[PDB]
């Protein structure tokens, strides 16, 4: 009982805790698997703003020339 | 199509002429002039046929940088003839 | 008071370093506060004290 | 609580004056070892979590306590050695032992496969410098080159294995998170996936093949018989085998079947060579192959009994073999050549050390239950459930374990020592302290080793 | 050539043997010419006299490596059932890697390469599955 | 010894010493004031 | 040399800026040839027969490199006709683009100049200007990361570590070992470019800093292993400890931050269903470590290079980045593993 | 571009741009389709 | 992954300066230790007595690594947020690509021994 | 036979092979810019025909 | 000949000069190190430490389960019919086919 | 040293009425010491001849280091009676060459910064006369001379200008009687054939020294000890078409940068080639380097040290 105080965390700790660490771990694992799933799609088809190659130009010239 | 079958062929012939050697180091620099000359004609035909007007200045700039290499590399060739008697590929010391 | 600081300048650092480790790792409990009162395993509605599990 | 007192041991040696050094490095590590036994011994229903994953927790690790116990014990042995060298290099050396123990604290506590591996390989660099410098014998460079040739060629296949598993299934990181485990369907692509995870821990856990890594590191010793205890920690440093076999691949263990067979002759033929050899350190080096081969046999069976025997054997070998190296250190500091035939005669010069020779040699055998019998007996009883024929192979090993201890005793019991003019002084106060601080924890673990052999026990 | 390598994964699908051996020599002979092409640039004494001899020592041996590896693949196909096995073409790599010590009279270099060539060529036949790719795009 | 035969450095610089001790404080003020500005910016945006 | 040496050095700095900040194909062409005119005077310096031979061997390989690169620029007018650095738009021009950039870098087939050029450099100040020069062709390769074929980049990356790993084993010259580690590291550079163009820029950051820490610590004059041997006892013993932190980091060791490229290059490649290539990367990397294995024994051991002449006067070199950079080169794996995002 | 040119103009690279006086390109009308088609990233990575 | 709606010149975007910066972080302290470590080995290469007790130009070495490290961490906090933001927005827009599977108690083979 | 000679041999074989294949790249082609440039013509010819990319 | 290398050192004191010592150099510091601070770690960590190794740390429900099992044996024998074990974890769950 | 673009430049307010005048070739006896002391009217600074204690005297702090720490078993008294079997012979000469290279580097630095007339007592270009004379009789091994020539080819070529005025002293073969007349017990009882070979080798060494476009002047014993005759000849004879006349912008600055630091100039002096006579053993050299660190000279830094100075910590 003396060893339980100021030397031990207790059974309440690491049961309420660790599950909190697992809750962050579950979020870290699912989003990393989602990142592997998103990059597998975004690289194959140019749909989103990920792995997009730069284009030539947006605007260059529109004025009237001396063309035929 | 028609002309590009010769001037590209002249480039590949000069590409062989650079890397092939018969001990003379002067001939390699002479072929570097030809390489830039073949690049000059190939660029000229692409710009003159498809009327660019803006890109016509670019081979003129290319002509400047053609002579930049084919003089500063030529000056190093003279330094070989200062240290050694006559310029040869066989005459080397590096390992 | 004057001789102890010069002779035992390094002798104090290691047990005080343990106190620094005792405090820093204790402060990590506030980072892990999710399901502290929640999750049915040791959960009980506390009234005299706020937040039983640390 | 184990982060930044070992890091606070680093400036202690540099700041302290030239007269002290050794008095500070030992005293401010013994109280740190007291706190490990004070806090880490507590367990709930399953594995806990001390903090967020920088250093995690303990599941079946009283092996962490052993490293904390050897945290001052290496400094005890290297006292006669490094006494005539430069004072700045003494400060440089103790920090390198501390750095080894720093990463060793990290590897046992961290319940990762990614953070564990890079700090498992972070123990390789300090040992390399510790072996290749202060080596008393010539061709110590072969002991340095092959140390990183055998290990790294087997362990770099973990990078292509571990990252491949987390790319397919969630993430390895938290381990207690990793119960998304799908059974391995036994395919040809999965063949090299299993092999790459194992081969990394087939080098540090010595088999019959790829076992030359160990004796060369011991014959060409880092320091006489003092820094060999760190190489004993590297032997038990292959504890990742307990975690990989359990979590990463539980279904496919058909490929484990040839590896048990390879380590089965790594019991008899590794003990046969350890009978004629001249070097006293090599007679411990080849015996350390066989006792650590017991774990490799055990783990690959994957039965609950084998894990009880293995975890006991990891602690058993860490305090018994290291104690034998301290006896080899005491003989080498007097004669300056580790020849067994030359150094012959106890009791005539060393009366008290002869009793400590017995309490260290006989522990290789199964004495009244210390931790070695408790380690071995559960493994032999586990091999019978695997196959009935094993005890015929295991029984030969039980005979040659007596040929380990008694042959070390008899070749020192023969009272002569005619050519020896040295070894006049019996033993220093710190010399007998090494004999006590290694054996008395083994004697205290005779009573109740419940907090030693504990993977759910 | 890429066209010849793609033909190599169509002949063993059936039971054709006499054209399979010629397909392996066309790879081994061409790869023998590649290794020998660098050896010409290593200063050959007397041009077109010992330079032809330097090509003759490499191209003939490398084609013979492919010839035996081609032939033993057909012997292992006829004898014993189950055509698709890593162990089936392991002996083919061993017999093909046996004549590496036939270039020079030593019988030790070829014997050491026998286990190495036998294992590496088996990995190629292991690489028919989806879990083995040398080059990838995404 | 008394630094005989012309010493290269006695270190009474005050030119380099004044700038090294000076600019470090100038770095301290520049980092905290922008941090205090960013603390106000984080509250205003969200 | 007065201001003119700084002006020449500033035009290499300006030369790569034209390569970095660019959109036009002839603009980067100038940027490469701005360096060609500016490295050669620093290649010469001390009026040596070795310096004349190295510069001529350097020029004739790299002048042909630029003219092969200009061919790729002209084919980009033959087809499409757009002069914006984004894609080659050709299966033919992409071949003449990658192989031309391989000539300027230390990639597999055009590597023969690298060791003999490095030997002919007079001083440690000129030795930096090859490791820093490799930023210029790498910057273009980052811009044209698509439309370039795997069969003629990855083969040149795999072979370069093979020839780099066997190219320093029969060498004792300190310049030659650094020249073949250059060939070795370039294989780790171009292997990432298809499997996400990111981390190639960070691989430069680790490499350029780690190479610059070497030559700044080689300011105490040493050209061979036997000349760097007399350093443990005749010279300062703390200097051997700090070079040990840079020798071991160049090889694949996790406690040091030279493992930080070998962290992500394998990680990004394994994401895209390729395992057989990263295995071949790590095993051949041990041969690169093996050069430093025998080179650590020059500093860790006594090795008996005493020499009767003893130096009493303290060494005073330049040592500009010799203190700030090795602290980052030794430890950054624990400091910034999130720096992948900050760099690219 | 590895480093972009912000708040400064040094382009004049693409065809059918600002004319020297008023002189047209030989393929002026075709790039009026091409630049307008591929101004976004949709047909840059896929090019279909 | 790669940059899309982002431009160079001035490393942080300033338009997306919403997330809170790192305040007294353990990551800042470790670079601060490296700033101190760079101020220890400078007295080792250039021969100066006592790495701990020497010349006080070390204050510049501590501040520089903290200053550069702060903006480097600010770039880290920005780029990791944007990479996450573009990932979340891709799922919200398409929806058909990311499929959800829930509630399963599927039969699996049991291993012996 | 086993523990010293044969069980070691497997990797000393790869050490001896790496040291033997080192000479085929270091000691090979002693000087001469002719010899280095002649090999470059072959590498282009391999890339055009053998390792074909159009 | 080496002209510098031949200088051998062989000095093992142990008893000659300090009379009673654990290590060389300074006898006053040696008594305080080899006999005092080594033995305080020999006393506290081994004797006062032994009251933490196995002596009352509770330790993974070893004594807890004894009080838990004894009350469950009497409960399922008097009230229930099966003797504490029949089916594990799954009472009428989802079938395989 | 690095930024010379401002006021401080080479040949600025210098190289006019200031020249390096080397007084060398004293055969065996200390005859050059009298001529150098007399030549103090025109020349501003006159450096003494380099010995065993010079390396500790310069750059250190006043008092010379002990014989065990400064030069490993190196003594001038051992060369007075030279003997076989693990003796000095060559390793003292290698230490003597290192000291003479050090004093020339200091003198040339003293010439470039603040233009003054520098007088040197036996320079680098007279050292091979002192070595080859010892080689003619059975003293030094053949391989050691070739080791010396490797140092000779590297260290000298770093310095572009050799000398301005070289003084030649040719005395009578009865110079051994003058050496016996001088109060030196160590210098006495030396070989007469060695001193005769030293004068014979110097005659064939003075010819390339004179042909190297440096003003060479010969002096006799009767012409010696003259303050008026020696000074008038130095002022009248002008150096023309010599290697000393070089470009101030390129040649002089590169010479000044190489001579600015002592460690940079002596970096080429340490040869990697292993020699049994040149001290190879590291085990005893480890304690010898530790004894130098234990010594209260420098040990801690280039300038400031504990229990020596240090006004401020920063």
Swiss-Prot record, chain A:
GO CC aspect terms: mitochondrial inner membrane; mitochondrion; nucleoplasm; respiratory chain complex I
This protein's UniProt keywords: Electron transport, Membrane, Mitochondrion, Mitochondrion inner membrane, Respiratory chain, Transit peptide, Transmembrane, Transmembrane helix, Transport
UniProt KW Oxidoreductase keyword: no
Domain of life of the organism encoding this protein: Eukaryota
Localization per record: Mitochondrion inner membrane
Similarity remark: Belongs to the complex I NDUFB5 subunit family.
Biological role stated in the UniProt entry: Accessory subunit of the mitochondrial membrane respiratory chain NADH dehydrogenase (Complex I), that is believed not to be involved in catalysis. Complex I functions in the transfer of electrons from NADH to the respiratory chain. The immediate electron acceptor for the enzyme is believed to be ubiquinone.
Assembly and interaction partners: Complex I is composed of 45 different subunits.
Name used for this protein in its record: NADH dehydrogenase [ubiquinone] 1 beta subcomplex subunit 5, mitochondrial
Name of the gene this protein is made from: NDUFB5
Residue window of the full protein shown: 119 to 186 of 189
Swiss-Prot record, chain G:
GO BP, one annotated term: mitochondrial electron transport, NADH to ubiquinone
GO molecular function: NADH dehydrogenase (ubiquinone) activity
One of the record's GO cellular component terms: respiratory chain complex I
Catalysed reaction equations from the record: a ubiquinone + NADH + 5 H(+)(in) = a ubiquinol + NAD(+) + 4 H(+)(out)
InterPro entries: Complex_I_Subunit_2, NADH_DH_su2_C, NADH_UbQ_OxRdtase_chain2, ND/Mrp_TM
SS bond list: none
Family assignment from sequence similarity: Belongs to the complex I subunit 2 family.
Role noted for this protein: Core subunit of the mitochondrial membrane respiratory chain NADH dehydrogenase (Complex I) which catalyzes electron transfer from NADH through the respiratory chain, using ubiquinone as an electron acceptor. Essential for the catalytic activity and assembly of complex I.
Name of the protein: NADH-ubiquinone oxidoreductase chain 2
Organism of provenance: Bos taurus (Bovine)
Swiss-Prot record, chain K:
Membrane topology of this protein: Single-pass membrane protein
Gene Ontology cellular-component terms listed: mitochondrial inner membrane; mitochondrion; respiratory chain complex I
Entry coiled-coil feature ranges: none
TM stretches of this protein: 36-56
Role, per record: Accessory subunit of the mitochondrial membrane respiratory chain NADH dehydrogenase (Complex I), that is believed not to be involved in catalysis. Complex I functions in the transfer of electrons from NADH to the respiratory chain. The immediate electron acceptor for the enzyme is believed to be ubiquinone.
Subunit and partners: Complex I is composed of 45 different subunits. Interacts with BCAP31.
Protein's UniProt name: NADH dehydrogenase [ubiquinone] 1 beta subcomplex subunit 11, mitochondrial
Lineage: Eukaryota, Metazoa, Chordata, Craniata, Vertebrata
Gene: NDUFB11
Portion held of the full protein: 54 to 150 of 154
From Swiss-Prot, chain L:
InterPro entries reported for this sequence: Deoxyribonucleoside_kinase, DNK_dom, NDUFA10, P-loop_NTPase
Predominant place of localization: mitochondrion
Post-translational modification remark: Phosphorylation at Ser-211 by PINK1 is required for the binding and/or reduction of the complex I substrate ubiquinone.
Pfam family, one: dNK
Gene Ontology terms describing biological process: mitochondrial electron transport, NADH to ubiquinone
GO cellular component: cytoplasm; mitochondrial matrix; mitochondrion; respiratory chain complex I
Modified sites of kind N6-acetyllysine: 83
Annotated compartments: Mitochondrion matrix
Cofactor-binding details, from the entry: Binds 1 FAD per subunit.
Keyword Electron transport: yes
Record family assignment: Belongs to the complex I NDUFA10 subunit family.
Subunit structure: Complex I is composed of 45 different subunits. This a component of the hydrophobic protein fraction.
Protein name: NADH dehydrogenase [ubiquinone] 1 alpha subcomplex subunit 10, mitochondrial
Encoding gene per record: NDUFA10
């Amino acid at each position: 009982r003396w060893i339980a105080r100021t030397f031990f965390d207790g059974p309440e700790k690491n049961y309420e805790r660790t599950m909190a660490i697992l809750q962050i771990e579950a979020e870290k694992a699912e989003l990393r698997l989602k990142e592997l799933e998103v990059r597998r799609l975004m690289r194959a088809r140019g749909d989103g703003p990920w792995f997009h190659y730069p284009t030539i130009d947006k605007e260059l010239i529109d004025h009237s020339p001396k063309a035929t | 199509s028609m002309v590009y079958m010769n001037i590209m062929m002249a480039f590949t012939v000069s590409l062989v002429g650079l890397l092939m050697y018969r001990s003379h180091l002067m001939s390699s620099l002479l072929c570097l002039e030809g390489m830039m000359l073949s690049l000059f004609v190939m660029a000229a035909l692409t710009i003159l046929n498809s009327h660019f007007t803006l890109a016509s200045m670019m081979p003129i700039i290319l002509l400047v940088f053609a002579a930049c290499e084919a003089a500063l590399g030529l000056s190093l060739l003279v330094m070989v003839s200062n240290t050694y008697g006559t310029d040869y590929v066989q005459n080397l010391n590096l390992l | 008071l004057l001789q102890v600081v010069r002779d035992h300048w390094v002798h104090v650092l290691v047990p005080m370093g343990f106190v620094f480790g005792y405090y820093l790792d204790r402060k990590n409990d506030e980072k892990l506060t999710a399901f502290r009162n929640k999750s049915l395993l040791y959960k009980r509605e506390l009234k005299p004290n706020e937040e039983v599990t640390w | 609580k184990y982060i930044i007192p070992t890091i606070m041991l680093m400036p202690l040696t540099w700041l302290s004056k030239n007269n002290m050094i050794w008095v500070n490095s030992t005293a401010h590590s013994l109280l740190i070892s007291f706190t490990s036994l004070l806090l880490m011994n507590q367990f709930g229903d399953n594995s806990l979590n001390f903090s967020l994953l920088f250093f995690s927790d303990s599941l079946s690790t009283p092996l962490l306590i052993l490293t904390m116990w050897l945290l001052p014990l290496m400094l005890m042995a290297s006292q006669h050695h490094l006494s005539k060298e430069n004072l700045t290099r003494k400060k440089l050396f103790i920090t390198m032992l501390i750095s080894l123990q720093l990463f060793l604290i990290m590897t046992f506590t961290a319940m990762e496969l990614i953070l564990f591996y890079i700090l498992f390989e972070a123990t390789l660099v300090p040992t390399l410098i510790i072996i290749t410098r202060w080596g008393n014998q010539t061709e110590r460079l072969n002991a340095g080159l092959y140390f990183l040739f055998y290990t790294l060629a087997g362990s770099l296949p973990l990078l292509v294995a571990l990252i491949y598993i987390q790319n397919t299934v969630g993430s390895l990181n938290f381990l207690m998170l990793q119960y998304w485990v799908q059974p391995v369907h036994n395919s040809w692509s999965n063949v090299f996936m299993w092999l790459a995870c194992m081969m990394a821990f087939m080098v540090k856990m010595p088999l019959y093949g790829l076992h030359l890594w160990l004796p060369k590191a011991h014959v060409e010793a880092p320091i006489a018989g003092s820094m060999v205890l760190a190489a004993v920690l590297l032997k038990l440093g292959g504890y990742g085998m307990l975690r990989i076999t359990l979590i990463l691949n539980p279904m496919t263990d058909f490929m484990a079947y040839p590896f048990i067979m390879l380590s089965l002759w790594g019991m008899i033929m590794t003990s046969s060579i350890c009978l004629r050899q001249t070097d006293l350190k090599s007679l411990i080096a080849y015996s350390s192959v066989s006792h650590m081969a017991l774990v490799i046999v055990a783990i690959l069976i994957q039965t609950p009994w084998s894990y009880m025997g293995a975890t006991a054997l990891m602690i058993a070998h860490g305090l018994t073999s290291s104690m034998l190296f301290c006896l080899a250190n005491s003989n080498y500091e007097r004669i300056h050549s580790r020849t067994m035939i030359l150094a012959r005669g106890l009791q005539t010069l060393l009366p008290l050390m002869a009793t400590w020779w017995l309490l260290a040699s006989l522990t290789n055998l199964a004495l009244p239950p210390t931790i070695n019998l408790i380690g071995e007996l559960f493994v032999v009883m586990s091999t019978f459930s695997w196959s009935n024929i094993t005890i015929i192979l295991m029984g030969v090993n039980m005979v040659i374990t007596a040929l380990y201890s008694l042959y070390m005793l008899i070749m020192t019991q023969r009272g002569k020592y005619t050519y020896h003019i040295n070894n006049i002084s019996p033993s220093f106060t710190r010399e007998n302290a090494l004999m006590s601080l290694h054996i008395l924890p083994l004697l205290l673990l005779t009573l109740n080793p419940k907090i030693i052999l504990g993977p759910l026990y | 050539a890429k066209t010849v390598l793609r033909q190599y994964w169509d002949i063993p699908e059936g039971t054709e043997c006499h054209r399979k051996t010629y397909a392996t020599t066309s790879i081994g002979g061409a790869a023998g010419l590649v290794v020998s092409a660098y050896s010409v640039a290593l200063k050959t004494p007397t041009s077109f006299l010992e330079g032809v001899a330097r090509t003759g020592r490499y191209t003939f041996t490398a084609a013979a490596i492919g010839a035996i590896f081609g032939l033993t693949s057909c012997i292992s196909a006829q004898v014993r059932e189950k055509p698709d096995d890593p162990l089936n073409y392991l002996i083919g790599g061993c017999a093909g890697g046996l004549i590496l010590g036939a270039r020079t009279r030593s019988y030790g270099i070829g014997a050491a390469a026998c286990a190495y060539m036998g294992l590496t060529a088996a990995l190629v036949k292991m690489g028919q599955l989806e879990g083995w790719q040398v080059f990838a795009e995404p | 010894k008394f630094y005989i035969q012309e010493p290269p450095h006695g270190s009474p610089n005050w030119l380099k010493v004044g700038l090294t001790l000076g600019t470090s404080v100038f770095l301290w003020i520049y980092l905290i004031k922008q941090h205090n500005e960013d603390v106000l910016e984080y509250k205003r945006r969200n | 040399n007065p201001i003119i040496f700084i002006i020449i050095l500033l035009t290499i700095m300006l030369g790569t800026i034209i390569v970095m900040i660019s959109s036009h194909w002839l603009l980067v062409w100038i940027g490469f040839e701005m360096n060609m005119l500016a490295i050669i005077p620093i290649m010469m310096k001390n009026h040596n027969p070795r310096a004349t031979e190295a510069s001529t061997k350097y020029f004739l390989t790299q002048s042909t490199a630029s003219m092969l690169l200009m061919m790729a620029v002209i084919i980009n007018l033959m087809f499409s006709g757009q002069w914006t650095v984004m894609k080659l738009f050709n299966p033919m021009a992409s071949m003449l683009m990658t192989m031309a950039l391989a000539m300027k870098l230390g990639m597999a087939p055009f590597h023969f100049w690298v060791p003999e050029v490095t030997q002919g450099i007079p001083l440690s100040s000129g030795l930096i200007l090859l490791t820093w020069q490799k930023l210029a062709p790498m910057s273009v390769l980052y811009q044209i990361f698509p439309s370039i074929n795997l069969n003629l980049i990855l083969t040149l990356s795999v072979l370069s570590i093979l020839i780099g790993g066997w190219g320093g084993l029969n060498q004792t010259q300190l310049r030659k070992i650094m020249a073949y580690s250059s060939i070795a590291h370039m294989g780790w550079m171009t292997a990432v470019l298809p499997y996400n163009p990111t981390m190639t820029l960070l691989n430069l950051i680790i490499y350029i800093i780690m190479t610059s820490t070497m030559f700044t610590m080689f300011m105490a004059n040493s050209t061979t292993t036997t000349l760097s041997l007399s350093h443990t006892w005749n010279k300062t013993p703390i200097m051997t400890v700090l070079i040990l932190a840079t020798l071991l980091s160049m090889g694949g060791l996790p406690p040091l931050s030279g493992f930080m490229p070998k962290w992500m290059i394998i990680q990004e490649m394994t994401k895209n269903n390729s395992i057989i290539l990263p295995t071949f990367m790590a095993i051949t990397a041990l041969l690169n470590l093996y050069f430093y294995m025998r080179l650590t024994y020059s500093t860790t051991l006594t090795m008996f290079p005493s020499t009767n002449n003893m130096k009493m006067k303290w060494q005073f070199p330049l040592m500009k980045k010799m203190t700030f950079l090795p602290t980052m080169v030794v430890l950054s794996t624990m400091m910034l593993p999130l720096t992948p995002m900050l760099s690219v | 571009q590895k480093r972009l040119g912000v708040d400064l103009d040094r382009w004049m690279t693409i065809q059918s741009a600002e004319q020297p006086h008023g002189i047209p390109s030989r393929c002026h009308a075709f790039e009026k389709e091409w630049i307008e088609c591929a101004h976004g990233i949709g047909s840059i990575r896929a090019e279909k | 992954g790669r940059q899309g709606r982002a431009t160079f010149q001035f490393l942080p975007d300033e338009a997306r300066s919403l997330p809170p910066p790192k305040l007294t972080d353990p990551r800042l302290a470790f670079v601060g230790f490296l700033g101190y470590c760079s101020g220890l080995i400078d007295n080792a290469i250039r021969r100066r007595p006592v790495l701990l007790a020497g010349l006080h130009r070390q204050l510049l070495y501590i501040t520089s690594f903290v200053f550069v490290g702060y903006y480097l961490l600010k770039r880290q906090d920005y780029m990791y947020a944007v990479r996450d933001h573009d990932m979340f927005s891709y799922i919200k827009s398409h929806x058909x690509x990311x499929x959800x599977x829930x509630x399963x108690x599927x039969x699996x083979x049991x291993x012996x021994x | 036979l086993l523990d010293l000679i044969w069980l070691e041999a497997i990797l000393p074989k790869t050490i001896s092979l790496a040291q033997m294949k080192a000479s085929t790249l270091v000691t090979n082609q002693k000087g001469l810019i002719k010899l280095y440039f002649l090999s470059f013509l072959i590498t282009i010819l391999i890339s055009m025909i053998l390792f074909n990319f159009h | 000949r080496w002209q510098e290398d031949p200088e051998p050192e062989d000095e093992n004191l142990y008893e000659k000069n300090p009379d009673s010592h654990g290590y060389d150099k300074d006898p006053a510091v040696d008594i305080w190190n080899m006999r005092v601070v080594f033995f305080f770690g020999f006393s506290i960590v081994l004797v006062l430490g032994s009251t933490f190794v196995a002596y009352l740390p509770d330790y993974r429900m070893q004594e807890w389960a004894r009080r838990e099992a004894e009350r469950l044996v009497k409960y399922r024998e008097a009230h229930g019919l099966p003797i504490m074990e029949s089916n594990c974890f799954d009472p009428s769950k989802i079938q395989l086919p | 040293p690095l930024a010379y673009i401002l006021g401080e430049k080479a040949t600025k307010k210098m190289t006019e009425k200031s020249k390096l005048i080397t007084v060398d070739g004293n055969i065996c006896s200390g005859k050059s010491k009298l001529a150098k002391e007399i030549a103090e009217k025109l020349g501003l600074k006159h450096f003494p001849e380099a010995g065993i204690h010079y390396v500790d005297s310069t750059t250190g702090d006043g008092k010379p280091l002990p014989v065990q720490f400064s030069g490993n078993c190196s003594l001038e008294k051992f060369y007075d009676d030279p003997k076989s079997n693990d003796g000095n012979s060559y390793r003292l000469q290698a230490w003597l060459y290192a000291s003479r290279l050090l004093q020339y580097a200091d003198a040339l630095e003293h010439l470039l910064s603040t233009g003054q007339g520098v007088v040197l007592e036996r320079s680098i270009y007279s050292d091979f006369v002192f070595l080859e004379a010892m080689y003619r009789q059975g003293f030094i091994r053949k391989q050691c001379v070739d080791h010396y020539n490797q140092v000779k080819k590297v260290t000298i070529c770093e310095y572009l200008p050799p000398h301005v005025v070289v003084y030649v002293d040719v005395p009578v073969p009865e110079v051994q009687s003058r050496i016996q007349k001088k109060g030196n017990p160590h210098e006495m009882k030396i070989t007469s054939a060695y001193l005769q070979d030293i004068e014979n080798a110097y005659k064939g060494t003075f010819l390339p020294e004179m042909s190297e476009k440096c003003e060479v002047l010969q002096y006799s014993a009767w012409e010696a000890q003259d303050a008026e005759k020696v000074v008038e000849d130095i002022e009248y004879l002008k150096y023309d078409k010599g290697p000393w006349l070089d470009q101030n912008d390129r040649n002089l600055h590169k010479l000044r940068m190489l001579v600015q630091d002592k460690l940079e100039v002596l970096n080429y002096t340490s040869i990697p080639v292993f020699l049994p006579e040149v001290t190879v053993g590291a085990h005893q050299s480890d304690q010898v380097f530790q004894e130098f660190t234990e010594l209260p000279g420098r040990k801690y830094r280039a300038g400031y040290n504990e229990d020596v100075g240090d006004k401020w910590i920063w």
